[PDB]
Amino acid sequence: SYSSKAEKNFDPRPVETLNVIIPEKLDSFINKFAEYTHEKWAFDKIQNNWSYGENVDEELKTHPMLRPYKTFSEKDKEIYRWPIKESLKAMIAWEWTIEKAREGEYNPQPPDLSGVTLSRELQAMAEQLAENYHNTWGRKKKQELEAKGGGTHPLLVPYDTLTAKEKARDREKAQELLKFLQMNGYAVTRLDTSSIEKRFAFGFLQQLLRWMDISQEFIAHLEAVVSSGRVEKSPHEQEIKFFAKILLPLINQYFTNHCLYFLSTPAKVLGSGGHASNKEKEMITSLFCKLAALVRHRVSLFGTDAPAVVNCLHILARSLDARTVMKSGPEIVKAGLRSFFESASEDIEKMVENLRQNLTYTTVALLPVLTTLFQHIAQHQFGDDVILDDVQVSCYRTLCSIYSLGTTKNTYVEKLRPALGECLARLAAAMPVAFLEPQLNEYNACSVYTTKSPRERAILGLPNSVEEMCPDIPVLDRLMADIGGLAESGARYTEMPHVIEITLPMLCSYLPRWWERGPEAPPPALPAGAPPPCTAVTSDHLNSLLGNILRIIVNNLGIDEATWMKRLAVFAQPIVSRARPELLHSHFIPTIGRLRKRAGKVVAEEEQLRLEAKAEAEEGELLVRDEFSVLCRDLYALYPLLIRYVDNNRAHWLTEPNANAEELFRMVGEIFIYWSKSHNFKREEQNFVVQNEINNMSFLTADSKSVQTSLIVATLKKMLPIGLNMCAPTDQDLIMLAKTRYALKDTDEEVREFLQNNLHLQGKVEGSPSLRWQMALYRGLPGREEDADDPEKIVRRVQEVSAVLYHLEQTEHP
Amino acid sequence: DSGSETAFREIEIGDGFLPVCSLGPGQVGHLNLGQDVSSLRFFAICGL
Question: CA A399 to CA A405: how far, in whole Å?
Answer without folding.
Answer: 10
